[PDB]
Structure formats: C-alpha cells, structure tokens
C-alpha cells in the first residue's frame with residue numbers, strides 16, 4: 001500500500017506520437033487514466049507507463065478539474081508542436 005509517482009520524458013525526436021488513449025474525467029465534483037498504450041508509440045517504447053495509470057501532469061499542464069475533451073485537446077496541441085514531452089503519472 002503506497003503511491004508511486006514517476007516522471008517519464010519521451011523520445012519525441014524518434015517517435016512522432018505518444019501512442020496512448022486517455023479515459024475518465026477530473027471535471028466532475030468529488031481522475032484521468034491511461035485507457036490503452038499503442039505499439040510504435042513513445043509511451044510503449046519507454047515501457048514504464050501501463051494502462052490504468054493516472055495522468056497527473058504533461059509538461060507545464062496539470063490535468064486536475066479537466067473534462068476528457070479538454071484533456072485530449074491539451075495532448076493534441078503538445079504532440080502537434082515540436083519539442084520534448086514529460087508525463088507525471090501515479091502507478092495503479
């Protein structure tokens with residue numbers, strides 16, 4: 001019984017996509033998780049992140065109080081723009 005928080009910086013120069021899908025909503029009163037990891041993606045290459053892991057922060061953006069649409073939109077814009085990508089996730 002512990003909380004494991006890992007920071008993973010992805011090789012975005014080699015892989016042009018995260019290859020992940022996010023599920024859930026942190027929007028409602030009272031989180032956002034990795035639904036699935038796609039092969040050929042940066043997240044699959046790193047191997048540390050697994051499905052059911054809670055997504056806390058990407059780069060300088062925090063996913064708290066975010067709807068699924070908004071959360072997907074943040075990720076689209078970050079992947080679209082050139083640069084490195086760093087995820088903070090809480091292991092299930």
Ligand SMILES: Cc1ccc(NS(=O)(=O)c2ccc(CNC(=O)c3n[nH]c4ccccc34)c(Cl)c2)c(C(=O)O)c1
Nearest residue numbers: 016017018019020021022041072073075076077079080
């Ligand atoms: C959640 C998310 C959002 C954006 C992402 N990057 S991306 O903007 O460059 C992106 C966006 C969209 C796709 C493919 N399109 C869809 O997956 C897609 N397009 N419309 C959809 C509706 C429901 C579920 C999926 C989709 C790809 Cl292959 C890559 C990524 C990613 O790079 O893994 C993940």
